[PDB]
Amino acid sequence: VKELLEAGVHFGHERKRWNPKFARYIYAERNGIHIIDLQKTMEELERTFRFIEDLAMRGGTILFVGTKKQAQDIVRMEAERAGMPYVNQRWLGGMLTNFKTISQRVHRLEELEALFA
RNA sequence: CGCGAGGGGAGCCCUAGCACAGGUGCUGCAUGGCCGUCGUCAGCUCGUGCCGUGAGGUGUUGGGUUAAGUCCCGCAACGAGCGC
Ligand SMILES: [Mg+2]
Ligand SMILES: [Mg+2]
Ligand SMILES: [Mg+2]
Ligand SMILES: [Mg+2]
Ligand SMILES: [Mg+2]
Ligand SMILES: [Mg+2]
Ligand SMILES: [Mg+2]
Ligand SMILES: [Mg+2]
Ligand SMILES: [Mg+2]
Ligand SMILES: [Mg+2]
Ligand SMILES: [Mg+2]
Ligand SMILES: [Mg+2]
Ligand SMILES: [Mg+2]
Ligand SMILES: [Mg+2]
Ligand SMILES: [Mg+2]
Ligand SMILES: [Mg+2]
Ligand SMILES: [Mg+2]
Ligand SMILES: [Mg+2]
Ligand SMILES: [Mg+2]
Ligand SMILES: [Mg+2]
Ligand SMILES: [Mg+2]
Ligand SMILES: [Mg+2]
Ligand SMILES: [Mg+2]
Ligand SMILES: [Mg+2]
Ligand SMILES: [Mg+2]
Ligand SMILES: [Mg+2]
Ligand SMILES: [Mg+2]
Ligand SMILES: [Mg+2]
Numbered sequence: 001v002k003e004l005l006e007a008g009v010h011f012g013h014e015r016k017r018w019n020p021k022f023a024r025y026i027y028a029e030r031n032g033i034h035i036i037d038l039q040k041t042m043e044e045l046e047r048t049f050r051f052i053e054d055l056a057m058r059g060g061t062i063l064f065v066g067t068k069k070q071a072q073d074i075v076r077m078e079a080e081r082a083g084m085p086y087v088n089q090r091w092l093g094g095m096l097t098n099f100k101t102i103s104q105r106v107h108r109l110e111e112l113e114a115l116f117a
Numbered sequence: 118c119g120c121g122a123g124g125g126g127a128g129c130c131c132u133a134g135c136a137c138a139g140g141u142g143c144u145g146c147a148u149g150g151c152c153g154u155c156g157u158c159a160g161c162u163c164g165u166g167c168c169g170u171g172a173g174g175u176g177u178u179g180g181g182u183u184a185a186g187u188c189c190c191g192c193a194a195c196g197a198g199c200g201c
Contacts, residue, residue: 093175093194098166101195 003042011036061085 015033018026025044027037055062064086066075072088079086087095094102 091193093192094166098193098195101165105195 002045003038006041007038011038011041063087065091067091 012033012035015029018034025037025040026034027040028035052062062084064075064079064084066072066088067090075086075088092102
């Protein structure tokens with residue numbers, strides 16, 4: 001059921017701003033706009049979710065991100081819809097690499113929670 | 118130490134020798150301290166992270182505002198320290 005539903009409203013986008021690398025996943029080009037190979041997506045979808053489901057049962061925590069507005073809140077709801085960590089709230093420098101100093105901002109939010117109740 | 122003779126010790130004083138004092142003599146280019154100054158100027162940096170072979174850069178820049186690096190929004194940065 002995954003297939004046609006993608007063709008539902010989830011393929012083809014952009015034009016003349018692509019990247020030759022991505023070209024292998026491309027199918028054609030109508031109206032000047034690029035048409036993505038729907039059938040090939042399906043394959044990558046399988047391999048991906050294999051890892052997704054795997055790391056899920058492994059109990060891993062996935063970090064979701066998308067500051068882009070056209071996916072702003074969609075990242076939000078789906079996040080609590082799994083308890084999985086995430087940030088579409090505009091990314092930051094050292095989110096992961098400087099996770100130490102960043103997490104201190106959290107420990108400060110905890111303290112604010114302390115006076116918030 | 119004795120009844121007293123007399124002698125002797127502390128102290129202080131002078132005379133004597135020695136140890137040593139004393140110096141507003143030099144060096145602020147050997148120094149502490151304190152003070153003047155740019156300046157009551159908004160400025161000067163640290164930790165971590167990222168960029169760079171490196172000196173270093175980023176933050177501290179940008180837009181708004183203030184007496185002000187004041188605050189705000191923004192931002193590969195997140196905070197913090199001596200400063201207002
Ligand atoms: Mg803080
Ligand atoms: Mg006698
Ligand atoms: Mg006698
Ligand atoms: Mg006698
Ligand atoms: Mg006697
Ligand atoms: Mg007698
Ligand atoms: Mg007598
Ligand atoms: Mg006599
Ligand atoms: Mg006599
Ligand atoms: Mg005598
Ligand atoms: Mg005696
Ligand atoms: Mg005399
Ligand atoms: Mg004399
Ligand atoms: Mg002299
Ligand atoms: Mg001096
Ligand atoms: Mg002032
Ligand atoms: Mg530090
Ligand atoms: Mg450092
Ligand atoms: Mg350096
Ligand atoms: Mg900062
Ligand atoms: Mg500076
Ligand atoms: Mg600088
Ligand atoms: Mg900048
Ligand atoms: Mg600023
Ligand atoms: Mg300013
Ligand atoms: Mg930001
Ligand atoms: Mg900033
Ligand atoms: Mg301040």
